[PDB]
Amino acid sequence: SGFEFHGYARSGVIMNDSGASTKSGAYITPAGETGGAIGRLGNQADTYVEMNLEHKQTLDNGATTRFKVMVADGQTSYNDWTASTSDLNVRQAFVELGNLPTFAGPFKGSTLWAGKRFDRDNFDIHWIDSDVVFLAGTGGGIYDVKWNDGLRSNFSLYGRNFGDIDDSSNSVQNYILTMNHFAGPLQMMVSGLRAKDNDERKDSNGNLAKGDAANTGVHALLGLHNDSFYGLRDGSSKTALLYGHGLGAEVKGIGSDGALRPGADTWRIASYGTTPLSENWSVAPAMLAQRSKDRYADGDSYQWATFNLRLIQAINQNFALAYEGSYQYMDLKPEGYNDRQAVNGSFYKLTFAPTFKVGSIGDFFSRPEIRFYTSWMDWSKKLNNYASDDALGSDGFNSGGEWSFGVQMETWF
Amino acid sequence: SGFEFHGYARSGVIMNDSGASTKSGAYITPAGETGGAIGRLGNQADTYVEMNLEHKQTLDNGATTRFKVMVADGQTSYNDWTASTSDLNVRQAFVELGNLPTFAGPFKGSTLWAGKRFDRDNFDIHWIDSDVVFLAGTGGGIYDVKWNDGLRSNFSLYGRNFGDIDDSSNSVQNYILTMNHFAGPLQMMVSGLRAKDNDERKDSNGNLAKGDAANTGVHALLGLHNDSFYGLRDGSSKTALLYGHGLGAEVKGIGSDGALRPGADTWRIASYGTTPLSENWSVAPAMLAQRSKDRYADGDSYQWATFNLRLIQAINQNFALAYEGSYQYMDLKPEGYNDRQAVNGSFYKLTFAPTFKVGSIGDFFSRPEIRFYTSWMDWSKKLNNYASDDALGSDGFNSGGEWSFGVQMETWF
Amino acid sequence: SGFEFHGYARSGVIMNDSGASTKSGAYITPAGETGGAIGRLGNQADTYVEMNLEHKQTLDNGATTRFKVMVADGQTSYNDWTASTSDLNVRQAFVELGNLPTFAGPFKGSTLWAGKRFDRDNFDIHWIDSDVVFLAGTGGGIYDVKWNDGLRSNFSLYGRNFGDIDDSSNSVQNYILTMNHFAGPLQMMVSGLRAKDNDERKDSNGNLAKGDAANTGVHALLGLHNDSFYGLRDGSSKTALLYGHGLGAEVKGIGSDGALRPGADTWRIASYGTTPLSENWSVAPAMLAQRSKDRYADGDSYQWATFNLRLIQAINQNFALAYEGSYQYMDLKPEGYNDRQAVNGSFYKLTFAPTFKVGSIGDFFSRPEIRFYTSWMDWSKKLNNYASDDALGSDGFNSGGEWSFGVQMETWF
Ligand SMILES: [Ca+2]
Ligand SMILES: [Ca+2]
Ligand SMILES: [Ca+2]
C-alpha cells in the first residue's frame, strides 16, 4: 500500500474548586516514583501527543516492507505556543521486513526488524496509564518464529544508554538480550541485561555518580492471556508476574534505571479484566502491586498496591457516565536515598465523568471520546512527608479532601 | 474519510542595498509592541511553518469525528540546519465530534470539541499579519447551537497560563468563558476572564513579578461580516469593534497578557474590504487603530492607527504586479515601563512586488505565489527613541530612507 | 495530485568486543574535519531521520504546484525518549511552480522556486556519506532554462548565515550567486559568494571572532556524468573537479564555512562508479581527495585521499553479503589552529555485512535493507596526536586493531 498516519493524544484541563491549578497525574503519590500508578480519569492535565508516520509496502510475492517514525511531545502548559518548553522528539524509527519468500521452516511467517522502537509485544493497563512490560531502545530482532506449530518465539537485542550521552565519562551503553515465548494463553519472557562499567561513571565534577550501581541484570515475565474475564464470565483478562534482579530490578522499563544496586530484587504483579454487566454497564477492575528490596540503598524497601476500578454506563448511542475508583496502599523505606523519608498510608480517588463518544460505549477501547469530570482525592497525611518537592503536601495540596473539575479529549487511531 | 495534510508557510530573503541584513517585520515599529502591525509584503524574512495533520472520519449515521495536530516553527536563520535555534512545538491537539444523532433541538447540527486549539471562528486581516480576534488555549466547548433558526451561538471554556510553567510560584492558570453569538452579518462576542492570584506571582528571587497585575477581565467584540465591499460595490468586508478591561485589555490575544493592570482599558477598530476595480485590478484597503490606557503603568497611554493598502494588477494568467502602501501614526506614552520613552510620529512603507502564481490573480487568497520585491521605508526620527534595543534606530536602521530587496514564497492548503 | 510522504532513515547499534560503546562515523579521522569522509558501512550508530511532507498539485493546463517541508533529527542516544537532547528542526520549506503556460522560449518547461531548500541538482557519493556539491539555504531561482535545445541552465540566489543569529554583532548574511550549466554528460557550475563584514564579527566579549576571515569567494565545479562505468563496462559513474577560493574554499557545503581566510584555496576530486561483475556480484569503487592551503591559518595545509570499495554478493532474492574497504591517507598541517598538531599517516577499515532486503540486490540504491556486521579498523598511531578531544586516541580507541559489531536499518522512499 502506501502511507499511514496513526497516533495517540490526550489533552485537557483540570482545576480546583477555586478555579486555579492543582496537582494531578497517574504517578503523583510517593509510590509513583517506583511505578505505583493510580487511576488516570480526570487526573491528567497534560497535552501529550504521539504522531506515527508510516510507509508500508506489500510486494507481489507476499513480502512486506514497513517503515515507521514516532514523534512525541508532552506539555503541561495550556498555551497555543510552547517553543520554550517543547519536548518534541523522535521516539521510534524502524524497519520491518515481513513474510520473506526466502524464510522457510520455523521462520515461515516471521518478521525481521531493526532500528529504534517500542517492542511490538509490550502490553499495558490503560486505566492506570502503565505498561505491564515496556521493552524499547535501539537494536534488532525477529518476531514469530514458530516451532512445532504451537510455540512461537521472539528473539532480540535492544540497546539503551545510561547517563548523559554528551559526557563520555558519564555515559554507558546497556545491552539487553531477550527471548519471548508464547504457548497458547501462556507467556514466558526472559531477558539478560549488561551495561559494562556502569558503576564507574563519573559525574561532571570527577566523583563517582553511584559506585554501587549494577553492571548486569536478569528479568523475567510470566503471563496469562485469557479470552474470558478470568475464566468465569465473558470478557478478557491478563495476569502477569514480573521478576528482576540487578539492572533488571526495574520490571516495567527494562534496562531504563541505571541507579539500581547489584542486589536490587523486585516482584511485581499486574492484572486486569474487562466484562459487561448488562447491555448498558461495563466494568474494568485492575491491580498493580510491587515489592522492591535493596533497590537504590542497602536495606531499602518499597511496597505498594494499587486497585483501580473503571465503570461505564451507557445512556445513549453517544452519551455515557464513567466512574473511577482508585485505592492505593504504600509502605516506603528509602533509607535516605534522595532525601526521601520512610512513609506509609493510603490514597483514595473518586471520579465521576460524563462522557461523549460515537463508537461502542461498551468497548473500553473505542477512543474518540470527550469527557467532563469531577474528582475527589484524600490520603493519609503522613504521605506528605515522603519528599518536600512532592505533590502531596505541597502548597494547596496537603489537606484531607481535594476537589477537581475539567474537560479533556483522548483518542488513538 | 481518512488523513488530511493542511498548512501554511512563508519563506524568503530580505537584504538592503548593500547586500547585508536589515530589520523587517509586520511588528517592527514601536507601535508593534501593543499590536500595531504594518504591511507584511516584502517585510518578512523568517521561515515560518504550520503543519496540520488530521484524521477525519464520517460514520454512516452522519456523525463525524475529527482529530487535528498543529506543529509550528519560525526561524530567522537562512541555514539548512537549525537545531540549535529550533522553535518546533505543538500549537494544537483537539478532537471534534460533529452532527451527533443524539443531539436534538438547538443542538441539531452542533459540533462538540475538547483539547488545545485555535478557536474555529477567529478571523484575521492577512495583509497586515494580524488576527482581529485570536482566542486559543486548552479547554472545551460547542459550536453552532441554533436558536429560532436565525441565531447561532458558540459557548466555551479556554484555559491559558501566565509565567514560567516550571516555577510553581510564578505560574498561574487563566480561565476564559466566552459566548459568541451570530445573527446574519452581525456578531457579538462576550468573554469573562480570571487568573486567580496573578498579582501574587513571585519571580525566581522572591519578589513580586508585578504586584499591580489584574486577576480578572472582560472582553467584547462587535462585528459586521458583509458579502459586499462595504455595501457599495462587489466584494467583501468586515468591521469589528473590540473592547476590553483588565485582563481583557489585550483585545487580540485574549488572556495572553498577564502584565495588564486592573484598570487597563482598550478600544480597537479593525476593518478591511476586498473589491475588483476591473478584470485586471484588485484592491484591498485595511485599517487597524487602537487606544489603550493604564495598560501596564498608571496613567500610560498607547494610541496608533495603521492604514494598509494592497493592490494587484494581473498581467498574465501567471504574472502579476503587487503593490503595498503602509502608513502608521503613533503617540505612545509608556510612563517609564520597560525603559520605554514617550514617542510620537509616523511610519511609511512602499513595496513593489512582481508576483508569480497559477491561481486566480484577482483572488487575494489564492496562495501558491512567489514574489520578488523592493521596499522603501522611512519614519519620524523621534520614533528611534522609544527603546534602545528596538529596530528603529539600531545600527544601520536609523536614517531616513531604507531600501530592501528579496524573494519569498507563501502558501496555504 | 495531493499529499506525499518521502524520507530517509538510518538507525542501528555498534558495540566493541566487550559489549560497550566505541567511536564510529564517516568523519572520525583527523581528515574528517575538512571533509575527509570514510566508509559508512557498520560505522554509523546514530538514529538520523528526514521527514518530507509534500503537497503537490497538477492543473489542467499542465502547470504544477509543489510544496515541501523537511523536518530532520539526529541522535546518538539509543533510548526511546530523547526530549532533552532532541535536534528536530525544519531543514527545508519551499515552493515550486513548474511548466507555466505563460513561460515560452528557453523558459518553456522551466521550474521556478523560492524558500529554504537543498538545491535540486546536488549529488552525493552514498557509501561514504558525503555530497559531491551541497548548495542549500534560503533564496530563489529557476531550473532548466533551455538554450538551443542542448544546453540547460539553472540560475539562483541562496542566502545563508554566519555566527549566532541571536547576536546582532556576531551575525552576518552570506549571499551566493550561481549558474549551473549542463551540456550532455558535462556540467559546469560557477558561484560567487559574499558576506559583507564577515571579518568584523565581534564575539560576546567584544573581540573580533576572526579578523582575518574572508568576505567574498568564488566556487567552481566541472563534472562528468556517464551512463556507463567510466566508459568501459556497463553501469554508471560521475567524476567531479571542485575548486574554491576565499569563502568558496569549502567546496562541498558552499557558503557554510565562515572561518575561511581570503587566501584559502581548495581543489577537490570526487569520483565513483557502479558496475555488475556478474549476475551476483556488484562493485562500487569511490574516491575523494583534497588539497586545501591557507585555509584557516596562514601557511596551513590539509591534504587527504580516501578510497572506498563497496562490494555486494547476492545469495538469495532476500539475502546478500556486503563488504566494504576503506583506505585513507592524510597529511595535515594546521599551524596551531584549534590546537591541532600536524599529523600524517593512514587509516584502514574492513567491514563484512550480512544484508537482508526485498529489492534488487544488484542495485546499490534499492533501500529497505537490514544489516548485521563486524568491522575492523587500524591506523598510524601518529594520527592520535592531531587533537586531544578527537576519537582516534581517546580512551579505549587508541590501540592498533579495533573490532565492532552491530545491526542497523537504512531506507529512503
Ligand atoms: Ca510532600
Ligand atoms: Ca530604537
Ligand atoms: Ca586524538
UniProtKB/Swiss-Prot annotation, chains A, B, C:
GO function terms (MF aspect): carbohydrate transmembrane transporter activity; porin activity
Keyword Transport: yes
The UniProt record lists the keyword Transmembrane: yes
Keywords per UniProt: Cell outer membrane, Ion transport, Membrane, Plasmid, Porin, Signal, Sugar transport, Transmembrane, Transmembrane beta strand, Transport
Top-level taxonomic group: Bacteria
Location in the cell: Cell outer membrane
Any GO BP annotation: monoatomic ion transport
GO cellular component annotations of the record: cell outer membrane; pore complex
Membrane topology term: Multi-pass membrane protein
Assembly behavior: Homotrimer.
Function field: Porin for sucrose uptake.
Family that this chain belongs to: Belongs to the porin LamB (TC 1.B.3) family.
Domain notes: The C-terminus helps to anchor the porin to the outer membrane.
Protein name: Sucrose porin
Native organism: Salmonella typhimurium
